Amino acid sequence: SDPAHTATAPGGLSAKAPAMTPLMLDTSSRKLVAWDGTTDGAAVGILAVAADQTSTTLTFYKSGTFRYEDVLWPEAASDETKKRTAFAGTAISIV
Amino acid sequence: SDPAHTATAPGGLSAKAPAMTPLMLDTSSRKLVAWDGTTDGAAVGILAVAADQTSTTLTFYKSGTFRYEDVLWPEAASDETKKRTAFAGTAISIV
Amino acid sequence: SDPAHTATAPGGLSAKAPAMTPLMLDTSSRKLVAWDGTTDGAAVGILAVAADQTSTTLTFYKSGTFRYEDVLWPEAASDETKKRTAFAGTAISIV
Numbered sequence: 627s628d629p630a631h632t633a634t635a636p637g638g639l640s641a642k643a644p645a646m647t648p649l650m651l652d653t654s655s656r657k658l659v660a661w662d663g664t665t666d667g668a669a670v671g672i673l674a675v676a677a678d679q680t681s682t683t684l685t686f687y688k689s690g691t692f693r694y695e696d697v698l699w700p701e702a703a704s705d706e707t708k709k710r711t712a713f714a715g716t717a718i719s720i721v
Numbered sequence: 722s723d724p725a726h727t728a729t730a731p732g733g734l735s736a737k738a739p740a741m742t743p744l745m746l747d748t749s750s751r752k753l754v755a756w757d758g759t760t761d762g763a764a765v766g767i768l769a770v771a772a773d774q775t776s777t778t779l780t781f782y783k784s785g786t787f788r789y790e791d792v793l794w795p796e797a798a799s800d801e802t803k804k805r806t807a808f809a810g811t812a813i814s815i816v
Numbered sequence: 817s818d819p820a821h822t823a824t825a826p827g828g829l830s831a832k833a834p835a836m837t838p839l840m841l842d843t844s845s846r847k848l849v850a851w852d853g854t855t856d857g858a859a860v861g862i863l864a865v866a867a868d869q870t871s872t873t874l875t876f877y878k879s880g881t882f883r884y885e886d887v888l889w890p891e892a893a894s895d896e897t898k899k900r901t902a903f904a905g906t907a908i909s910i911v
Contacts, residue, residue, distance in 0.1 A: 631818035633909030719728030723821040810860040814823030
């Protein structure tokens with residue numbers, strides 16, 4: 627059934643991020659942060675619980691199938707195809 | 722023993738590709754294309770339904786365990802070990 | 817609660833490695849070896865059954881959630897955060 631499993635890890639958000647926000651790793655600290663929508667293949671998960679700069683840990687999805695319209699993509703990710711394969715290689719996919 | 726889940730995403734194949742063909746992302750468009758068999762760690766999935774250059778969306782496995790002899794590796798992938806770990810880090814593995 | 821699936825792949829350990837040891841791919845042979853704890857994002861799995869340099873094949877975890885305290889991290893991995901996100905992007909996560 628391809629269940630959407632959650633996970634937790636240190637977060638380094640710099641602002642509020644609603645649930646369904648794509649995440650990537652900060653190349654410096656390696657904490658989870660919002661995917662910029664421009665670094666190819668950097669997306670690693672989807673935030674499952676709303677969080678902000680005070681959240682020391684984030685709860686995010688590490689698997690499952692998510693609908694293209696439900697994911698809250700960053701504005702900078704203007705290409706539909708690149709968004710649809712943003713998680714290729716992970717256990718997450720987009721429909 | 723682990724479920725072989727499928728996923729779908731934009732396709733950009735250059736030619737006909739049968740099911741069980743290892744896929745990677747086109748470095749430019751980021752559409753799914755056949756794994757070249759030489760770019761280390763580029764494989765992201767295994768084509769689940771035969772397709773070709775006219776297929777705009779492909780269906781592929783994003784998880785599961787597959788027999789080394791069942792996967793249709795590209796001729797350029799000439800090293801058995803490199804093929805067997807081509808999916809290390811994804812939900813797919815080879816047996 | 818997510819299942820911890822195992823997998824097998826060629827091994828290139830240079831010494832004895834107990835279960836729960838993080839694994840990465842050797843850049844040259846691409847066999848599974850112990851993660852060095854310094855190459856960012858190189859961890860691809862966690863050894864599931866003890867092995868050593870004579871082990872031609874390793875059985876490892878390719879998914880699941882594991883306790884930070886249960887994983888036998890290499891000494892070089894001295895930053896807690898980097899260890900906690902060492903598997904981000906794979907089906908494995910740390911709690």
